[PDB]
Amino acid sequence: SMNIEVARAARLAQIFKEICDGIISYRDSSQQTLAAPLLNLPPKKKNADYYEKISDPLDLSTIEKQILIGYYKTVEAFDADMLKVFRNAEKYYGRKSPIGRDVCRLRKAYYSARHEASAQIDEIVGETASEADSSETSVSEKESGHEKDDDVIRCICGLYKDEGLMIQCDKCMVWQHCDCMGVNTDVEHYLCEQCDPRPVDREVP
Amino acid sequence: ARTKQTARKSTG
Ligand SMILES: [Zn+2]
Ligand SMILES: [Zn+2]
Numbered sequence A: 001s002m003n004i005e006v007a008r009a010a011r012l013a014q015i016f017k018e019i020c021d022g023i024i025s026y027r028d029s030s031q032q033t034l035a036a037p038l039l040n041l042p043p044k045k046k047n048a049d050y051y052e053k054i055s056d057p058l059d060l061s062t063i064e065k066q067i068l069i070g071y072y073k074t075v076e077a078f079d080a081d082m083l084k085v086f087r088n089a090e091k092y093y094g095r096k097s098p099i100g101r102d103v104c105r106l107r108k109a110y111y112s113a114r115h116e117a118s119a120q121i122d123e124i125v126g127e128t129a130s131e132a133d134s135s136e137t138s139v140s141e142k143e144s145g146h147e148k149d150d151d152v153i154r155c156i157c158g159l160y161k162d163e164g165l166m167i168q169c170d171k172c173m174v175w176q177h178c179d180c181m182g183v184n185t186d187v188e189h190y191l192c193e194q195c196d197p198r199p200v201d202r203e204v205p
Numbered sequence B: 001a002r003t004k005q006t007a008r009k010s011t012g
Helices: A004-024 A048-053 A060-068 A075-092 A100-124
Strands: A165-168 A175-177 B003-005
Touching: A004 A060, A004 A075, A004 A100, A060 A075, A075 A100
Parallel strands: none
Antiparallel strands: A165 A175, A165 B003
């Protein structure tokens, strides 16, 4: 049977291949592959701590292979994987920019090629995948609303008041009380019941 | 992730 969905998936697949190819083997004038620290997972044996917090470090050379197998299908998941390796790079390697300037350069050429490939995506996917040319590295829409400060309360309580103990959504940078959400104030990368609702299967019949 | 423990945290 004919499916536009499988045509779109395979279309973008070989096309992602183009873009990710430029990034994987992106070289400076001295012929250095800047994406090297991201394209290869590190020796697992001497990194329990690393993989404890970063339980999903990811690997570009593997993402590449996963592109051709048509696992991502659309750009949604594709763009996720790329922005993931860059962000965890900047996260644990150092303060905030360790290899940052190196992989952010890749990221810049990534968005450039993203912008480039937006042509075909337009003809294939359309506008349901939007443009995704809003810069940044964290979120794409960023705002996606009206307000979203660091000091803003957002709990199911509805009080909008900074009382008791509460943690911060890594993406919203909003405050949610620990007792309500079922937290232990131990979360390093907590996400809210919106961005990524974490399901806790506590002995549910 | 930052953790608030009552908005006021005056220590002295
Ligand atoms: Zn609450
Ligand atoms: Zn959130």
